Amino acid sequence: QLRREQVGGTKASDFLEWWVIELQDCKADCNLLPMVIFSD
Amino acid sequence: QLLEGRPDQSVVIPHLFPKYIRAPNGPEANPVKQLQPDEEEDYLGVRIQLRREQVGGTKASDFLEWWVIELQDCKADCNLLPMVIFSD
Amino acid sequence: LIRSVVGVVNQPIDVTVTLKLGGYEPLFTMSAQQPSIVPFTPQAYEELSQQFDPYPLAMQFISQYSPEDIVTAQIEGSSGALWRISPPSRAQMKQELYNGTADITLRFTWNFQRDLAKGGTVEYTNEKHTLELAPNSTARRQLA
Amino acid sequence: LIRSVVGVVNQPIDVTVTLKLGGYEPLFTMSAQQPSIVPFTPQAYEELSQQFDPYPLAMQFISQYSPEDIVTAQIEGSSGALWRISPPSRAQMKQE
Structure with missing residues (x-):
């Protein structure tokens, strides 16, 4: 997800872009990704 | 208030910064217990400063923000923080 | 006895993940802390x-x-x-994604930072996940 | 002799400090070099x-x-x- 941000191509550069990830199958925890790790 | 937008104003950071620190060959590098017996009481403090920068909420996004640290008790070296480290 | 060992767990204090496309810049990167x-x-x-x-x-x-x-x-x-994206990089992104029928891949990678008091030998263990995409396909089109 | 060791000091060539708030992003980070x-x-x-x-x-x-x-x-x-602060992060900063 690329959320644009007005400030003040050139208009595209105006918006601030930042990649945002969301679970493909997400219901309520859309702003958080649980990733299980096995600490040996 | 700092992160919001307003004229220059400092924060409340109550001396969390220990002056004298020790760097053993050990996995990490601890502060010095003897020089800081009081721990946080003997630690030094700083203030966050957010200097805005006009370009061209949205006006807040317009200004460029960057955290600036400065000694709580600073006289002339305000733009520099000497931190003692012990290279073992 | 010299062979007996306690199974002391080594739990990574910190973790980092990054999402990078092409050889140009990381698009995204997080670090869940405590x-x-x-x-x-x-x-x-x-x-x-x-x-x-x-x-x-x-x-x-x-x-x-x-x-x-x-x-x-x-x-x-x-x-x-x-x-942040240097606009040259951005423009070449867009131009290649739109007409450049080459194969561009992500560089998605995970690093685990260990306690370093709990040992763990190397404490920055990480693995990379590079998977090529498809030109003339809706994946590249939606990315563009 | 195999036990004698010279106390050669190891002085860190570089140092880094960072100031981070929450789990969102570092607010500040500096590195004094030489x-x-x-x-x-x-x-x-x-x-x-x-x-x-x-x-x-x-x-x-x-x-x-x-x-x-x-x-x-x-x-x-x-x-x-x-x-840099992603504005979503900024807004949630302020609201919280």
Whole structure:
């Protein structure tokens, strides 16, 4: 997800872009990704 | 208030910064217990400063923000923080 | 006795993930620090157990790695920082994605930073996940 | 002889500090490189000595770590880089 941000191509550069990830199958925890790790 | 937008104003950071620190060959590098017996009481403090920068909420996004640290008790070296480290 | 060893678990204090496209710049990168790193309580360990209860391999593999040996990072998907992009890079991104019928791949990578008091030998273990995409396909089109 | 060891000091070439709030992003981070890393001269070691001279523990602890064994980093407080903040993160900062 690329959320644009007005400030003040050139208009595209105006918006601030930042990649945002969301679970493909997400219901309520859309702003958080649980990733299980096995600490040996 | 700092992160919001307003004229220059400092924060409340109550001396969390220990002056004298020790760097053993050990996995990490601890502060010095003897020089800081009081721990946080003997630690030094700083203030966050957010200097805005006009370009061209949205006006807040317009200004460029960057955290600036400065000694709580600073006289002339305000733009520099000497931190003692012990290279073992 | 010199051969007896206690199975002291080494739980990574920090974790980092990054999402990079092409050889140009990382698009995204997070680091769940302490509170987004939940070690499993025993109860979560049984939960993992019954969820994969029919499968025997899963049971033995869980039965080996104790609840303290398995943790979960709650990486904040949306809590990013600004993704700066040099406009030259941006333009070449767009031009190649639109007409350049080449093959461009992501460089998605995970690093685990260990306690370094709990040992762990190398404490920055990481693995890369590079998977090529398809030109003239809706994936590249939607990315563009 | 196999047990004799010279106390060769190991002085860190580089130092880094960071200031981060929450689990969202670092607000500030600095790295004094060579010229902001001042190793102590014997005179500076002496100065550290008289400043904490009444305290015995400080005296022994300094007496162990030679002037070459103790350095100071002059981290530039104000000379930072732009602190980028994804506006979602900023808004949630402010609201919380």
